[PDB]
């Protein structure tokens, strides 16, 4: 089963899904006239020519069956200014990311930024920027963009977040990308002993973060189905699968497995202690600008009795502001949030019809 969860953030149509296709082969199906709409999914095996992508070195130098380092998984988000609410959601599963900028369009493009700051906000600090469409540019253009990038990546937290220009269309230079992602996006340790806890983002599906599940365990889903109240659903793990291959157990990094109902639900040990809140204590901070749209208008402070999207974990819930202090507001929710720990959250506002990421904080119990 895949070790780790790498996210592919970035603006729309810069080709995020396409880069995922040059690396794994997989498409996200697509959406077929539009573009990626659900989080796409794909896995792959990374071995190395001591002396790669498939146990085969005789592609460069020679034969000695490349040594297997790990098997990774991706999460293709969409790129469209409005799928913001899912991409947020998705990050909750990531162990790291790769920012696909387009080589032939104006560097800080709305969503590119929106994402980037979301990344530095939630905690995904293991980042690799990638200059994509260099197969359609002047040898000057792609370097000057590398400049604007090397300059943005300055004051910000992004010291030596390297920048590997690619060609997702002709799959060129991807191997140096595999070397980046084999250096910088290291595979985090996870204590298993911990409480078995996992996030859901499809169902016909989700990612583990702490603990480990096994075939035939007794389990529950939170908040679960509703009545207006919200009760937990119990069942037995009928089966465990990663990619197309079945396993008997499942551990963090990866995604495991009608329409996608229990979206934003979480799965834990049956008979486990987790709060199904209706009202929550957020500590919090704001951006000074609204980085996302294609206008940077300065963030108005929170007024109470305002409706805001509270993105918690994979879930996406809506809620109203009952309390407004310096960095501690109290929120009343439509759909309950099962708070498994202490936690991270992301806070948005309907600025001009479309919602927009404006600030963050920490859930508090």
């Amino acid at each position: 089963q895949a070790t780790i969860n790498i996210g592919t953030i970035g603006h729309v149509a810069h080709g995020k899904s396409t880069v995922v296709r040059a690396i794994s082969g997989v498409q996200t199906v697509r959406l077929e006239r539009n573009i990626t709409i659900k989080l796409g999914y794909a896995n792959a095996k990374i071995y190395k020519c001591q002396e790669e992508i498939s146990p085969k070195c005789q592609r460069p130098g020679c034969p000695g069956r490349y040594k297997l380092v790990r098997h990774v998984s991706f999460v293709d988000c969409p790129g469209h200014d409005i799928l913001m609410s899912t991409m947020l959601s998705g990050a909750a599963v990531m162990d790291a990311a790769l920012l696909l900028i387009a080589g032939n369009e104006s560097c800080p493009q709305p969503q590119t930024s929106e994402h980037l700051a979301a990344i530095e906000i939630m905690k995904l600090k293991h980042v690799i920027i990638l200059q994509n469409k260099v197969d359609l540019m002047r040898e000057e253009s792609a370097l000057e963009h590398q400049k604007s990038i090397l300059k943005f990546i300055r004051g910000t937290i992004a010291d030596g977040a390297p920048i590997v220009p690619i060609s997702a269309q002709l799959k060129y230079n991807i191997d140096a990308v595999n070397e980046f992602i084999v250096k910088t996006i290291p595979v985090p340790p996870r204590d298993f002993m911990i409480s078995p806890r996992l996030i859901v983002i499809r169902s016909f599906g989700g990612s583990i973060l702490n603990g480990v599940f096994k075939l035939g365990d007794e389990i529950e889903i939170r908040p679960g189905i509703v009545t207006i109240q919200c009760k937990p659903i119990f069942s037995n793990i009928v089966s465990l699968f990663a990619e197309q291959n079945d396993l008997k157990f499942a551990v963090p990094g990866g995604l495991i497995g009608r329409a996608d109902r229990l979206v934003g639900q979480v799965v834990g040990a049956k008979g486990h202690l987790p709060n199904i809140y209706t009202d929550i204590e957020i500590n919090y901070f704001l951006l000074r600008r609204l980085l996302g749209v294609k206008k940077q208008a300065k963030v108005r402070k929170l007024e109470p009795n305002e409706v805001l999207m509270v993105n918690i974990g994979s879930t996406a819930t809506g809620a109203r502001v009952v309390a407004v202090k310096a960095d501690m507001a109290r929120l009343q929710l439509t759909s309950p949030a099962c708070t498994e720990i202490n936690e991270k959250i992301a806070l948005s506002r309907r600025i001009e019809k479309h919602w927009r990421l404006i600030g963050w904080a920490t859930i508090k119990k």
Binding site: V134, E139, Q146, P162, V164, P165, Y172, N173
Partner: peptide, 17 residues
């Protein structure tokens, strides 16, 4: 650090059609 990169840019360009 540009050298590493400038390098990378080189190596892709030399792989075109």
């Amino acid at each position: 650090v540009g050298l590493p990169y400038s390098e990378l840019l080189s190596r892709f360009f030399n792989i075109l059609r």
